[PDB]
């Protein structure tokens, strides 16, 4: 039942660790279970990557990286819609969105507070 | 029943769509939540934010590149031994095929979800 908790000490600086850590994971599972699920037909691997590691805080940089360039660009209306959806969820004070790509069958967890 | 939101990409279609999404997105997400519910939790006393953010976005595939990215700023004061220990614990889980780990900082209570298969 209990999730494995692995304490990793820092030499420069246990039931208590385990309790706090399990409570944290459980809170995330709770919030994740209420997160919106954004669904798209297809996403380039590179696009999903940049979305999965890029802060929403600078809108133009997010768009610039997601729009990409030239022959390998991502449609602007489509990228922009993804941003506004993610951003809307973020501004509600919430941390998570799930991004599902049908072509791939793959879901990814997006941290909106990155 | 979380909200499902379809974002269309007409530039890539012959024809406008077309509930298959609305239902399949739900299923893959349920599978995610289930696996995450059981993901190992790596817990540390504290971690510099600079180091947390890099760990949360970096592949475990190559250890030397991971360390390279973690200390890329030349100004990261996280002890190298501590960073390496975190890598080894994360890697061990990733080697099992596990997609997910939670990284939890007890000092702050800050908790991040780690994709172990970047």
Swiss-Prot record, chain B:
Record note on disruption phenotype? Abolishes phosphorylation of the alpha subunit of eukaryotic translation initiation factor 2 (eIF-2-alpha/SUI2) during amino acid, purine, and glucose starvation. Inhibits GCN4 derepression in glucose, amino acid, or purine-starved cells. Decreases vacuolar free amino acid levels during glucose starvation. Sensitive to the purine analog 8-azaadenine. Increases duration of lag phase on return to glucose-rich medium following glucose starvation.
Which ranges form a coiled coil? none
**What superkingdom heads the lineage?**
Eukaryota
Where, per UniProt, does this protein localize? Cytoplasm
Name the consequence of residue 16 to I: Reduces interaction with TIF11, Inhibits binding to uncharged tRNAs, reduces autophosphorylation, eIF-2-alpha kinase activity and ribosome association, but not dimerization
The role this protein plays is: Metabolic-stress sensing protein kinase that phosphorylates the alpha subunit of eukaryotic translation initiation factor 2 (eIF-2-alpha/SUI2) on 'Ser-52' in response to low amino acid, carbon, or purine availability. Required for adapatation to nutrient starvation by acting as a key component of the integrated stress response (ISR), by which cells alter their translational and transcriptional output in response to starvation.
Assembly with partners or alone = Homodimer; homodimerization is important for kinase activation by uncharged tRNAs. Interacts (via N-terminal RWD domain) with GCN1 (via N- and C-terminus); this interaction stimulates GCN2 kinase activity in a GCN20-dependent manner in response to amino acid starvation.
Q: What else is known?
A: Present with 279 molecules/cell in log phase SD medium.
Q: Domains: what does the record tell us?
A: The C-terminal domain negatively regulates kinase activity via an autoinhibitory association with the protein kinase and histidyl-tRNA synthetase-like domains in amino acid-repleted cells, that is counteracted by uncharged tRNAs in amino acid-starved cells. The C-terminal, histidyl-tRNA synthetase-like region and protein kinase domains are necessary for homodimer formation. The C-terminal and protein kinase domains are necessary for ribosome association. The C-terminal and histidyl-tRNA synthetase-like regions are required for uncharged tRNAs binding in amino acid-starved cells.
Which family, according to the similarity comment?
Belongs to the protein kinase superfamily. Ser/Thr protein kinase family. GCN2 subfamily.
Which protein, by its recorded name, is this? Answer: eIF-2-alpha kinase GCN2
What is the species listed in this Swiss-Prot or TrEMBL entry?
Answer: Saccharomyces cerevisiae (strain ATCC 204508 / S288c) (Baker's yeast)
What gene does this protein come from?
GCN2
């Amino acid at each position: 039942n209990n999730q494995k908790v692995i304490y990793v000490p820092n030499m420069a600086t246990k039931w208590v660790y385990e309790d706090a850590a399990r409570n944290s994971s459980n809170m995330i599972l709770h919030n994740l279970s209420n997160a919106p699920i954004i669904t798209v037909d297809a996403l380039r691997d590179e696009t999903l990557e940049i979305i999965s590691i890029t802060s929403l805080a600078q809108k133009e940089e997010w768009l610039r990286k997601v729009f990409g360039s030239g022959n390998n660009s991502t449609p602007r209306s489509f990228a922009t819609s993804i941003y506004n959806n993610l951003s809307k969820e973020a501004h509600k004070g919430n941390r998570w969105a799930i991004l599902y790509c049908h072509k791939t069958g793959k879901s990814s967890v997006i941290d909106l507070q990155r």
